[PDB]
Amino acid sequence: QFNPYGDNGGTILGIAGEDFAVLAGDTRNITDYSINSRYEPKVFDCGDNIVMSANGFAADGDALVKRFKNSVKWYHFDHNDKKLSINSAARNIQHLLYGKRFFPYYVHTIIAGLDEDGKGAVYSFDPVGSYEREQCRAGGAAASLIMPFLDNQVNFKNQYEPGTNGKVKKPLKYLSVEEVIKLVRDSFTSATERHIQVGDGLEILIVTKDGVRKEFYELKRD
Amino acid sequence: TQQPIVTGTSVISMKYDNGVIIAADNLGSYGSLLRFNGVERLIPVGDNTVVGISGDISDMQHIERLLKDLVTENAYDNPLADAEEALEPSYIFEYLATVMYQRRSKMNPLWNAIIVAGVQSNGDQFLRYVNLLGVTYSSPTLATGFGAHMANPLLRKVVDRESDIPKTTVQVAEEAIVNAMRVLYYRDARSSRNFSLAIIDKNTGLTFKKNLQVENMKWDFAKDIKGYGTQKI
Amino acid sequence: TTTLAFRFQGGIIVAVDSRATAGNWVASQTVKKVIEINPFLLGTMAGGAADCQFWETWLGSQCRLHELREKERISVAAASKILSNLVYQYKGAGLSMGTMICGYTRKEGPTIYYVDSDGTRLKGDIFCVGSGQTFAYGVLDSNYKWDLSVEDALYLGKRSILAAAHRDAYSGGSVNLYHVTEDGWIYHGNHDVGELFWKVKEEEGSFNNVIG
Amino acid sequence: SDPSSINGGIVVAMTGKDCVAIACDLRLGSQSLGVSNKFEKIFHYGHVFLGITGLATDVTTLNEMFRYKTNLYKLKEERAIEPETFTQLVSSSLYERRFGPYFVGPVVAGINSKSGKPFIAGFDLIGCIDEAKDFIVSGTASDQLFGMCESLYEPNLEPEDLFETISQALLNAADRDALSGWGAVVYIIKKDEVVKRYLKMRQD
Amino acid sequence: TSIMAVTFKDGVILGADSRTTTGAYIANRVTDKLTRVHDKIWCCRSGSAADTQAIADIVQYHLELYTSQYGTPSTETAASVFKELCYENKDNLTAGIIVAGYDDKNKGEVYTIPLGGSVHKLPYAIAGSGSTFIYGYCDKNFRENMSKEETVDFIKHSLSQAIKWDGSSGGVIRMVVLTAAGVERLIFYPDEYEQL
Amino acid sequence: TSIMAVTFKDGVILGADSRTTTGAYIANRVTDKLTRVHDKIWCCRSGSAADTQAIADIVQYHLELYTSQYGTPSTETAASVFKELCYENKDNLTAGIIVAGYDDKNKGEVYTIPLGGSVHKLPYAIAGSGSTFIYGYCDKNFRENMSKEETVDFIKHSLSQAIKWDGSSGGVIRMVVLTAAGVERLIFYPDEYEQL
Amino acid sequence: TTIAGLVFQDGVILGADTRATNDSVVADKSCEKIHFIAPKIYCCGAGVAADAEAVTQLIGSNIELHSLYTSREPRVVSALQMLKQHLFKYQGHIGAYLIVAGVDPTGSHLFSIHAHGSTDVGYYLSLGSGSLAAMAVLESHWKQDLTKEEAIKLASDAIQAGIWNDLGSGSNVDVCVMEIGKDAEYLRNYLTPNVREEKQKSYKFPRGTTAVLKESIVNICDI
Amino acid sequence: MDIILGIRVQDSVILASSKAVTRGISVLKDSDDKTRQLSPHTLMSFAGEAGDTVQFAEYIQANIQLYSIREDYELSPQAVSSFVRQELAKSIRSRRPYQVNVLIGGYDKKKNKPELYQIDYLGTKVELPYGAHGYSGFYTFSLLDHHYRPDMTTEEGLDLLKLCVQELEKRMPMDFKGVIVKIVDKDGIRQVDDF
Amino acid sequence: MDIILGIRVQDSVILASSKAVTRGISVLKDSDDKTRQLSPHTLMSFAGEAGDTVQFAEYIQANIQLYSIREDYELSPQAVSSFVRQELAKSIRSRRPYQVNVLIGGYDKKKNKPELYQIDYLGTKVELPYGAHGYSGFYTFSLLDHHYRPDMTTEEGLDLLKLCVQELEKRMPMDFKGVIVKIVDKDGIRQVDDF
Ligand SMILES: *C[C@@](C)(O)[C@](*)(O)[C@H](CCC1CCCCC1)NC(=O)[C@H](Cc1ccc(OC)cc1)NC(=O)[C@H](C)NC(=O)CN1CCOCC1
Ligand SMILES: *C[C@@](C)(O)[C@](*)(O)[C@H](CCC1CCCCC1)NC(=O)[C@H](Cc1ccc(OC)cc1)NC(=O)[C@H](C)NC(=O)CN1CCOCC1
Ligand SMILES: [Mg+2]
């Protein structure tokens, strides 16, 4: 019998700062135990200061991103070059995904950018379009490895003030871009060690009021 | 939904400093039966693109006709059909990738793995893969079927990353491809000795080589191997 | 999921947990399971995350169109029936949805309608829906009377979700509380279970099964 | 249906400077229903510590089995069993049930009393030994624990630092698993003192 | 696999290809499928490699113990031991064995033992996946009482075609000649047999 | 079924056995598997009898309508119509067709269309269940530009072996010769071909 | 797993990667797949990790007792025969795939063994998920009469091919060299091409960060 | 068999077990006692597959009674529960396992403490302040989490049990025909005849 | 939905329908009215798959109410039952059939006779002196075979119905939470509020 779905592996990570946001993803693409590519970009600039990644089955991920990029293009045509806000982009992506509710896009989607107050935003989707705004999200193969770490290091979970017995929680802070990138890099280095589908390279897209900047880092190729 | 009947095995390829190389054997297998010994699986499109196809041969012949029809259609009302409006590798690929993903989405796939090798207008090397699921990817080396498991390891020793491409000449790249084809003939049960190889160079253009044979084969060590353990004669 | 809604002397209490799961993976601890349809209408959400979000957001659009056309607030009965008739069209296709449509209108008074994805639509005073419903029912049914103070009713709804958050593996995160009156709904806060549990334990003297 | 995830729970172990740490959650459930919040998964036979995750009836059965075996070992050998030897005994005992296995994820932790060397090990259900320098993870949130350990861990941590690292690894992994949590215990093990600490965690 | 045994004037010759496959991967391209159960009693193996090796090892043991007690066993006797193992364990075995041997009394003899565990004495025998493609060729070209050179050519040409059409067959063509003179091993490489 | 088409100096010859089976019962022992889609374009049918007849009837219709409008169709054109039907309905058809025809420009041509609906132009072609047994024989004995008498013998000897080994094949050997001279039907009975 | 073995002038060499996997996560980054059977007989293992480990230990134990009984150096064919007969008995249920190599009074030998009990003789072999990557290298570069220096290079290269190109395989390269008339040299961590890079940050916590409910001393001593 | 509950208070253990026996279509009996006295201060309630339940209970009863005669001594509740657990843990890897879940409520005369053990058919033992088997716990544990205190009297334990039974009678689909209640304390085992 | 009964006496038809609504584990409601008034002298009770029951009943109700306005006339019970049967008989060969069983109790004002029709989800219609759907009839038909007479009063019909409900409460495994009873006679439809 023909199986329309596949698994191209990989892992992605979105973190929302105070006046910035990052969307990181490994550049490895796999099927079964074969490496297809060591550098196949998975995180895309979609215009209007929005970055997107649809990790899982790469054909469905490409299809979705392609459709969303087109949705941005037609939003400009139909509404007088109005900037598509990140909240509006998110709702649009829900409808793209739920449109195929009974033959799903087999991907975990994350978008990142800035909200209409200039604050950092990350939105996170299931395959059939349920979504929510979050400060922190990993998706894909090694999401189970990375997310607990981000709960601890981004949201300060299970961390208390020393000497308070355990009754004053570590207070929540925004992280600097330099601090976020350190946590991103360590998350992927860690995930590469223990997950066979993660490796080769790390590509980070950083979104600020000034635009979309890229950074690339080598990961272990075994 | 179907099952592939007459099939073609590995297509292998790589980038080098000035262009791309692609290769594929001339066999059409009918399961374990090595049925058709004269099947060309590299199909050129203009003088800048070669599409290498593995998998079902009936679906390959369909794709071959789509590409032939694509060239005809591009020429229509196009005074620059042999110049600035000629078909590019990237155009030919995106078309095929659209078709492959549409067909898998109707649950009636074209049962193939396709590599589009070519050189663009600006001299840039083009090399990209697509298969029956519409899955696409690019890499300095690409291979389908058994080639992915056996050819890529050998070809990646020559071009391990992007920065190794300018350092790789056409002689070194072709040598690596020809060796990889021998390894596949040793080890793939659905392969053949006879193959075709295509070089697409930004300076020298398209060189299409037919009726190549795997040569310099090591078999002599076989005479000394006796039994499966304890046998001495 | 644990969602509840119950009717009492001072209106409707609505309380939900905040956990979403993908098998045994905890997908989120900060999920919104109450949808604010209008100032007088709430929807609880349990089942498929997408199914709930999509169709209850859609329900809100259909309720807005009603008031544009009829120059009048949609009745709780009518709003619930729009959703129940929709899911009934999709019956068998595999939608997963369990919801309480809770609201006040002058003609109906405070009303709760349970609607689910196999087409059931029930009017009633008390409902608990989701994997943790049985746990919420245990606490709720024992301390339920018609005439609780708004303060006591809010606590019972909060406490009933807490009970289920504790015992049910697939319920947790935090408790979102609402109170529906003549004048509309009022949010009564997000209460993290990791702080609430210990607070309730000490003050109430309950949860003696736990090492504290 | 899957015996390794009916009851739920986790064990993690780590090495430090002249010390080891082993920790576990306290949950026992029947799938979604939480039953017990006092089900400890760490046992000790002399100075060798054994954590066991998986099907709870096998956890209890194997504890009783290794108590039996180490008691007889001690009577005959006239000394307590060491971690390296006990690891081999666990492996042997699991592999003899190769085709009808105990559905468990054991973890050995301890300090060799003669050499003073910290030692940890983990096993699959049929006895394959993983003898790690850094850390061992086991249970229904093993993926989560791998992620925490692989980022949080550094070598040669002092006992009171190592306590913080292993505790945070356990707590944050458990909070992302439906079938783990409900309390947690951490053992800090030195050559001739062992401290046991119950952790405050969210009870959902 | 492509295997055959052919009786001729001076005795018998066994022939085989050298390919072993796990699906479409060639696990061993230089396999020796001609295997010795006694000095001048050999067999060609097809089917499960594990099963045929396990059987061949047991037969070699039985004939070694036969020889200690009763002297040299006949080829018929060797075929019977193969049959007994194959037939009695037919539910648990995938083994297709050709038994060939040289006596001085009986001269060259060939016995084929297919999947069921039946025995068939024949002038020549062909077996394995690649044999299907040469039934026509072998029937037309086989003669009784051929010379050694003719029988080598007959086997070489036959297995060459079997190799050409069967993906499961390939590599070198190994042969083992069994006569009064002794035991001779022959090997033929691709560059020789492919151009026939 | 055992079917083949062979090009030669003067044109092309199609050959077939005459056996149709429903399991092990021979439903028709005198079947005509050589079927006319045009004056000098014929085909050999294998697979489902219902499917190949249904296809052949549609092709004959298409070529008749081609002839009314555009004159005599090429053999390539006939093969293309067969392909189109086979390929587009591959999920619902079990048809393995060999198309053979004579032009004066192109002379003898043979196209084979296996299960998938692919097309392959070849000097000769063999198909059907009984073809497996003669790949070896046909490869060794085929030459290009044979005479009519040689090609009749080549087919007769080939299908004789196919019939001998395949239970699904048998009966008479029918042949159809396609040259400039015209269309000649030949038949060969068991008592003739069995003793070859 | 990527395991390989090949012969050279007056010896045989074995190679192996050091990765173990449980589903898609790495269970071990430094596991020893080259196993001791006798002082000059070694075994590469692949497949079910407990099975390949248990079957080599059992045959190694029985080889030791056989050697004591006969007062002879054990032979590789004995290990081979014992392994295949055991594995055959279990009909593939002991999912161990092994490359056995060694030196004995007969000479140097190289065999492979599959889980169902089939054995092969070869001059170069590879097994496991990375066998195809390794065999590609061996088919490209292997020749007769290799020197020891060339053989270690080729073996390690064949394993590396698996490490880089196969997701099943990874981490380090273990080698064992068995030469005639010499002690076998076992070279664990012969290559170390996958050391983890230094981390960006230290996640060492402030002491007291974790909330504690109770403390107690555990009595581990006797009496 | 459907509902079996257990609650351990200050000075006693209370076991409540449903009276219905249903074979498919009909309720064959409405007064069934789903319990066996193992020893004078140890009571075992049980629920599971038809036949297996009683066969297992009576088998355990016979073994504990045999022990009592041989040693002229009552085994502790802890010892009886460990014996029962091992028999179930042995059972699960048998040709045909006992599909039986049990609660063991006992008064330890040495320690002067009530003890309640919950053991499932796999041999999963836990000591608890309150326990249940099957679907009962889904309704009753949230109540007990709310209302339970360790220092409760036997009368308070019974009232808390009435609240559990009322909840089950309100929200469960099956009519389990009420419960037989038995108290295990220092004085032995007695049945509460009006509940 | 579980139990629906119907009994036709001298001068009326009495329909009794259970109040429980159970979704798997929990009893979501204990006061559910499993009936719709189709016309002033025709009542339809219903039971079957969740959602389908109410959707079908309300659909039938809307069609009969539409007929009544169009013709300014009440259809006979026989005519309403034939309409309902055809809709169910049409339904069974659909893409997704209505899994609904119904009882139609009506008073024919022309003939001055009570009438009870039993129709299953296949569209199997029968006119009966007493009827039931699902497992109810297994217990209640033997009673009605014993105690029924055609000349019974409405009070005698209700007493005979109490005897049916008592038997169901004794022998059925499910707690159906009692029955809502409705009487259909010459004066129309009324609910018996104490049962
Ligand atoms: C957590 C609990 C106890 O199950 C609740 O019922 C919870 C409600 C969460 C929802 C409330 C409204 C706001 C958005 C969140 N449900 C889930 O978490 C839900 C459980 C579930 C899973 C699968 C399913 O299949 C039909 C039904 C219900 N989880 C999800 O929907 C998760 C986030 N996503 C998936 O499981 C992936 N989908 C892919 C395609 O098929 C549907 C499942
Ligand atoms: C990982 C790789 C590349 O496949 C190697 O084959 C590796 C060899 C390790 C071994 C070599 C000899 C010395 C001892 C170590 N194998 C594994 O890591 C193995 C892979 C595997 C998993 C499952 C399987 O099922 C048929 C076959 C092969 N991993 C394991 O055995 C792990 C540690 N355990 C499990 O996966 C759980 N088992 C459950 C019971 O069935 C067997 C698997
Ligand atoms: Mg790798």
Ligand SMILES: [Mg+2]
């Ligand atoms: Mg948890």
Ligand SMILES: [Mg+2]
């Ligand atoms: Mg919980």
Ligand SMILES: [Mg+2]
């Ligand atoms: Mg015949």
